[PDB]
Assembly symmetry: C5
Homo-oligomer: 172 residues x 5
């Protein structure tokens, strides 16, 4: 087997998922003994599950959502292309019963769900005040995050000459 060490032997297995052929090995299919695929892990002639004439095992499922599943079995990472529905993938995760994966999948969803849905950013407001002699400084030293909103005058020793409304963004 090209990829593996010379001298070794690999049991290639072909799956026909919903009409699309997938090539992989009995070895990759032992990853999860709780998955019904594990049935292939073990070599068995008196198991004869339905095959097509090329000998590929028949599965009645959408193949487009299968890749990410299979690939989880191959390298432990969940990887979904940007144009693909994770809902679809959650369904295959379940049908093939791979609890570790199902787990990750659900996280991928809430992770990108709390990202999507949220009403315009929340704003906080402060009111600053200063004597006139400290006006320049007050504004030129505006703290890191804040936005100037509005300057107001009072005035008539401690008299508060200028008010200043100032704002900030909240990101969550």
């Amino acid at each position: 087997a090209l990829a593996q060490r010379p001298g070794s032997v690999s049991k290639w297995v072909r799956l026909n998922v919903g009409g699309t052929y997938f090539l992989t090995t009995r070895q990759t299919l032992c990853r999860d003994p709780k998955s019904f695929l594990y049935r292939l892990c073990q070599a068995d002639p008196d198991l004869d599950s339905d095959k097509d004439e090329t000998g590929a095992y028949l599965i009645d499922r959408d193949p487009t959502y299968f890749g990410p599943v299979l690939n989880y079995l191959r390298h432990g990472k969940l990887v979904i292309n940007k144009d693909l529905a994770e809902e679809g993938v959650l369904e295959e995760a379940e049908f093939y019963n791979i609890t570790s994966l199902i787990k990750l999948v659900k996280d991928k969803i809430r992770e990108r769900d709390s990202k999507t849905s949220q009403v315009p950013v929340k704003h906080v407001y402060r009111v600053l005040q200063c004597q006139e002699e400290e006006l320049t400084q007050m504004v030129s030293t505006m703290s890191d995050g804040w936005k100037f909103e509005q300057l107001v005058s009072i005035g008539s020793e401690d008299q508060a000459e200028f008010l200043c409304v100032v704002s900030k963004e909240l990101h969550n």
Copy 2:
């Protein structure tokens, strides 16, 4: 049948939709006695010499249709146009599903189109000291607009969705 109990009913069917092969089972193709797919349902005699029934439809939109049959949830790829899935939902005549799609459509249409942000305004007033109090504890979604000195009038706003 690999994913099922040993010794089970399970007849495999191939569908050629618009020149794309789709494997499924008579079982999933009977979930609804109303579809035109229900004809394939119970084995009964247009196949290519690959034995696959021929269907004169676009296959890219069939995926979602076949999946509903498969599990009963409606799932659509982002890059995909729900009208496309609607059209097919009707062709094959899957009432329970035709319903679901018009939802997804109308759900994402209320999120799409709602006439420009209608703004509401109000003019709170307050005494000098409770000035901080006011602005500080401003209500859930309101923006500070302007502060006017008379003590003070504070104008505030909020959007409408």
Copy 3:
């Protein structure tokens, strides 16, 4: 050598090899628009036999990526384009296969999504209202249909209230 037309040049099912991608429909579908060049297959026109592969598929030296939507129009009469798919490319096809009513529906899509996208400077319209202290609260709250409050001004009439409106063309 081709004494007569190819067998099943009149077959119900029809395969199209568009630039290297097979599409499967029925002769019927292709009889939708008599003015169209695809009608030729419908009318079993001898000419085509030059451009029919050996399996039987009709050869078309065009990009297939834009064909499906065209084909589907013929199938069910609605225009449907995938979100990532460029309409200009569909417009080129609609025109090549010369399907007038489609070409039409396509040009609508373009102008519809352009008037949406390319919003040109939102020119504005300002009005300076005047409201006494009292009728201060009412004036803003029940402001006119599409009018943003812009500023409130005072004068020891009591308040001038600038208000605005966005125009979109």
Copy 4:
């Protein structure tokens, strides 16, 4: 001569690019006589290039980026799918060596490059001034592109000389290409 083979002097041609088949006519392969594709442009007597089981001209390139190339050769217009990367097209255009096309590509790249990142807009200002009465006249005639910034009441006076200017209006306008 021996037999009577049809399908010999044929107008159609199939290119197996990186393992995907592409269909076209020998003619389309004549747009740019500089491109090595031109070899198939005409029915070449003595040549004979490497084909596969199915008589397609094997090409060791990515087919996913070939589409635009071929289409250029078809109708002369460059058209790329929104999900595609022009770099990929750029690479192929060079391999097949189609100068006028390569030319079009680098335009598409730099064109959508000057769009992504560019320096924020420079505004411009103006201070209008007007009596109390001419207030509606001021707004009513604000020039085409100007936004209301702020309106200042001057608290108008009983002063000698300074007898002019009840309201000031700061106003603004962007600046573009």
Copy 5:
């Protein structure tokens, strides 16, 4: 074909997890460190698992192979938009192509800092100016500054006088990389 008349050219088909790829032994020599290299020569007594159609079998996801094989073809890293580079990164590591894995991590880190980067800080200044010179002031602000607010400040009786100071003008400027 793509080669000048009378040239050595030995084709190979890779069946990557169910999908076929056409390439040449030539291409699979870019990195003598990758196992793909075992195909660099037309090894007579090799016998790596092939299928019916004599294509070498590989238990990996094809969808992320393109970018790899492409890098082998021309040496540039190319990915489409809808593809996760995390996926590409894996295969880059599986076939073991140092140079590639290198460039792929650049691509991720590049678009990580792009994705999530902090809002823009600002600078504020409060100028004061005579009623008269007020038009001048806003009219001639420097290249990067925005007008923020004007504050009438003197007193009806003083407005227009010289030891005055009639408005305070708040003014701001964005800061960029």
